[PDB]
Symmetry: C3
């Protein structure tokens, strides 16, 4: 039986009419309004009975520990939830009053204080202070996590947190739009799918900003986007997280591979994370057989066919690597990193396609690291490096090929690789502030230090419309420049011609109809002439 | 009369209170809840009476054929609808167990099977199998389409489909946000405006992913964004559609131009479509007078002033062209295509502005197609090609100008165009794995095969700090290299000087105060000297 | 007391049950439905009593002047509001029937007419017509503004306007998603925070399109995103606004600094604004001490440490500067401007990092302006210019450093800066349509006009496989090319050797074992020889 009112009005129940969230969920039919703050107990569970609910949040879930949401019906939506810690945690704050890193371990230790607004909870990855922490801190109980278990096709809009976060366990097609006012506890949003051999899919974050937390802003465990590439992160700012800007988990959890495949990471801005601007790796540490994943014999360590798409990434002043990945058959396009403290860009895999990379001021801590590294056989096109140090290489990619590479400024400009592509274009018009400038050519690049050819333009009078110069061109022999022709030395408009120091052999003139000058045993100047018919005569002057 | 309850509670009606969707729509005032699956009949119509409704979908519309929605009021919103086929269609599945194309027509034919999850319905564009299909398949009745007729200013959020789609007929300012869980039937979302001489406008898709369907993920017919550029597609993944990743229709439908103008396509990822990664063309096939559009006399075929903006596109392993367009005054920036089976990027129009294009491994099927083609007079800046074949050209753009072009690897590096821009920069520092490397200059590029100048650095001893080289510089004559100077041949530190084979004429020394060596009629070595005053003397040695 | 109906139905009140919006707001508990158009009076106020409301708009707010919304509770959402003018304003329409600028002041004056659809209200920034306007126009009363006062954490979805806009005063964490059907009055969305010394934060626009208005599409006053970078604009189209595409206010309002810090501007498309494609400046005009901001002594004019992130910007045919900013420590990446009437890209600050800039056809009005300008010491990497005029410089950046710069076409290609980075790569393969082409090197670039070295490839016969050329290489002296070697002049396969016009001094041969030819006082050809031991002898021929 449905009365006339039942047929004309929207069904909604509100939390303030009940003692518990379970009582409200039981009563709910269509909508569930969270109209008053709710103090949950660690381990509390809410059974939604498979109902397709609109959960409209106008207040906070407050607790230390986990609130479990079970049997939420496919197609439900959760609108502006907010997970807030009950206890104020001690946090480590690694920044000074100018917003720069503080690394002195004594000063870092002294930053540990109860805060709701910034910093993250100290933990094992905090190698500088972990061993020095007093018991109340290591043993603190705080942080509010929502754990949504075994739900499919749920949309969260504008979720928030204050020392809290969201854990989706064995879920698929979870869409989280625009996290905001979001101070994380551990990882901000986690898609945890390792409890079965299936792969989580369709789980994505789009929009917004996640701040702090001891973990990564978004974390994937045993997710596979399919050839569909349905899953990943788009349009996110990850700010000062304790681990990596976003992360794909590596190796095993609880005995099953927690790795990830075929995701899309598009437009992620990572500011001052403590580890890597993005960490899209699947293997880490020493090789160990994979469980419920490809074997070592199928794909060697660091070489899984992850096939991620990574594009439009920018990271700034990250304490780890500016952006990195392993595996193979990934596509990476448009990655910009500034002030990475370790390498600026790192490919730990092989057989990846890498384009439009810009690295500025990596190796910021001067520990002899390279700006860009590739460990395997990758293909790089459109690379710009601006090192603010001479340490190491601009591009260290011994087994890779490179094209369209530019190294700016006065830092390292060294490129080590298998193949460097041609330069193409029209007229060449180069200029320099220094009085002399050069074209240098270094073939046999694997086994030479010095160029085989140097052509020099040397400006002797720099007066506009009244310029004077010397032109030079030289080969090399025993590591020293030799055989140098010059034009216009001292303004005399002549060619200076290098001549042999002793008897020239016939083999030293390659082509018919050519000559070479040389000095004889008593310094007599002579000409060896190779005639048009290939025979030889010598003229004495 | 309104009672007190009427003044305090939200109006909503729910489908489960009625037999039909029309009965529910008639009763509706504010909200309409779809709380149970609805089995519609092909051709069913729902008249919404001009009401401004919130249509909250928590279940599916199920049918074979069309469900018409008429008189939906401006400002309505449709929340998470789902169009689901009643009959399971036979679909063609063009991929193997590794996710690679299957093209053997026998194997493709054998992939035809009833599926709800993947593949698309076989149709006329399936030239390889169309003629071989048994009657039950060609004549199958399946697929669920919502047709929204003559509505303005409607927002759809998170629409879904299972062998279904959405058709907007004579609509304007339709916004479709984040299609998802979306397996299309024909084209996924279509804006169909050719029934009148007006142009549809403001119709856009933003976000999400559309999969399969026999058509294009989003299709525009007689839409014009205005100088406003209000209309198009942003932030979409188009996965394995049967036609093109997104498409602007060409030519006429039912006797009226179905073409499109002034749209924005921003951040589209197209994976393995059967035709073109994007198809932003307006004319196709043989020229025929346009109806209710610009005449042939006003704009020639392929040269309509479409003025689209196309940017941030990436396509992978598309069976057609990686990305293409016609018309003029379009702006194209940041297009990356991998593994296009036809051309990687194609401009079929003229007078377009094209920047930041990256094409890798186009012409994947080795049918002698070029990596990048422009048919008209376009302007290209910032082009990277990496062909994995020597077939054809990297850039085939005879009437275009190019700047900042790079061709990687060992594939084709040929550039054919009207003008190639200058290279600018500072010191030049080039390197190569091979023992010799070159600077080559090929002026008269329209009519030469061989370079007019080659400067060679040839490393003879590649020992670090103990290098030896020969430097060479040569002109060309009758297609063969000639006049070669060398420095340091065989380590003798001398210049090898080319001399004339016979009498040098006075005209063969251009400048006053210069000399040339030559051999006389009996092989006598001589010097022709052009004195400082321009007169001549000959020295015999 | 709550009855059984109270416990099962959603609370909503609707405007049509009341005379005023205040009466409806007073009655509201959860939701407030705007079900009929509401005619507000200028200065009207609505007190929402701190309630957390869902304001569901299905009709318009209509008025001339301001509607104030006060005490709206944190966490409220405002769904599809529409601000519509009561009086139809006179607007100026600066475009012809082809959508091109009209600049003849007589024609502009004649475009002033009552419109609801396009143009903006004439004002003081309209220097061409302001003094010529008849009283009814300058004194017109029109335009509908919603002013939301002192609210935190409010989301607006899909707001609209017809000669209207949205003003947020002393607000924080306002998120405006997807403005649309939005014809602005002044600035479209403004975050106005100068009334106190606090800085507004978290205020952002994401998505959509704003059209016309006399101001800027989005305007920031005294906002600071924090090191968090929480605030700014993402994914917006700004179309034909009367000021700048988006803007950070400069200097003071009412005696307090109205400047802005640490915002993100990502993916803004600006079409035909009357001032600058984006205006991200903090100081303007003549230096004056800052109030409640950094002093002049702390940071000089134009050099505040704004630390904005600006990326993925595209602007077209803007009447002002294509895109510009001041301050320092900003990051700018991926900015494309077409048809800017003033400079294409302008850095008025110093110590900024600038990458991936493409400027085409700036200085469109031929007023002798440069394509790209930097006033301070910035770092530029990856620059493409295509000037359609020879006026001025491609890059005018005297105190900056540049790397990877390309200048296309036949317009200006001049680069003025402190340091130009090296070109790196492999073999060099250049080509040209002209019969001759060159490598030119211009060291001492600050003080020279002409190159110190020119190497020329000159094609004399352009027949495929039958090519003939002359190779040339020359220095410079007294501003004229000199000392020219040639190879293969007139097809004789010889070297033409430049010789001194008079006695060569010993100093004119640098290296041991070298010779130079010269003419003696009676034109005798001679050889000065520098022997292997460094001593000299002269041979007479």
């Amino acid at each position: 039986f449905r009365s006339e009112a039942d047929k004309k009005f929207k069904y909604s129940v509100k939390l303030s009419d009940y003692m518990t969230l379970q009582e409200a969920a039981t009563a709910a039919v269509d909508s569930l309004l969270i109209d008053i703050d709710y103090n949950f107990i660690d381990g509390e569970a809410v059974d939604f009975g498979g109902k397709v609910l609109t959960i409209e949040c106008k207040a906070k879930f407050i607790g230390d520990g986990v609130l479990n949401w079970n049997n939420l019906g496919s197609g439900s939506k959760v609108i502006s939830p907010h997970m807030h810690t009950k206890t104020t945690p001690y946090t480590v704050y690694r920044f000074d009053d100018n917003g720069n890193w503080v690394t002195n371990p004594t000063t870092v230790l002294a930053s540990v204080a109860q805060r709701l607004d910034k910093g993250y909870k100290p933990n094992v990855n905090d190698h500088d202070i972990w061993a020095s922490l007093p018991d109340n801190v290591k043993n603190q109980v705080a942080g509010a996590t929502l754990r949504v278990n075994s739900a499919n096709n749920i949309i969260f809009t504008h979720p928030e947190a204050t020392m809290g976060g969201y854990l989706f366990t064995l879920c698929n097609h979870i869409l989280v739009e625009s996290p905001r006012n979001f101070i994380a506890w551990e990882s901000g949003i986690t898609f945890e799918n390792h409890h079965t051999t299936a792969w989580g899919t369709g789980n994505k974050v789009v929009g917004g900003e996640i701040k702090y937390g001891s973990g990564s802003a978004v974390l994937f465990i045993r997710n596979d986007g399919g050839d569909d590439h349905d899953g990943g992160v788009r349009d996110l700012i990850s700010y000062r997280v304790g681990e990596s800007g976003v992360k794909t988990y590596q190796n095993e959890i609880g005995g099953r591979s927690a790795r990830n495949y075929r995701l899309v990471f598009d437009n992620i801005t990572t500011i001052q994370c403590y580890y890597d601007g993005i960490d899209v790796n699947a293997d880490t540490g020493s090789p160990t057989e994979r469980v419920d994943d490809y074997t070592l014999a199928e794909y060697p360590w660091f070489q899984l066919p992850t096939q991620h798409i990574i594009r439009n990434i920018i990271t700034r002043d990250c304490m780890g690597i500016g952006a990195w990945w392993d595996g193979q058959k990934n596509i990476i396009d448009n990655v910009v990193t500034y002030e990475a403290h370790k390498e600026g860009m790192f490919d730990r895999g092989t057989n990846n396609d890498i384009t439009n990379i810009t690295v500025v001021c990596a190796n910021k801590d001067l520990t002899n690291l390279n700006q860009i590294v590739c460990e395997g056989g990758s293909r790089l096109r459109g690379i710009m490096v601006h090192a603010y140090t001479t340490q190491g290489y601009a591009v260290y990619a011994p087994s890779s090929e490179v094209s369209n590479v530019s190294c700016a400024g006065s830092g390292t400009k060294k490129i080590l690789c298998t193949y460097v592509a041609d330069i193409q274009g029209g007229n060449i018009n180069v200029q320099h502030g220094e009085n002399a400038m050069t074209l240098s050519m270094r073939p046999a690049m694997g086994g030479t230090i010095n160029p085989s050819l140097v052509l020099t333009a040397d400006c002797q009078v720099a007066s506009p419309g009244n310029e004077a110069s010397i032109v030079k061109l030289s080969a090399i022999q025993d590591g020293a420049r030799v055989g140098e022709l010059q034009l216009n030395r001292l303004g005399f408009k002549h060619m200076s011609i290098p001549v042999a120091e002793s008897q020239l052999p016939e083999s030293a003139l390659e082509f018919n109809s050519s000559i070479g000058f040389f000095f004889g045993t008593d310094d007599e100047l002579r000409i060896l002439a190779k005639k048009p018919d290939g025979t030889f005569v010598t003229y004495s002057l």
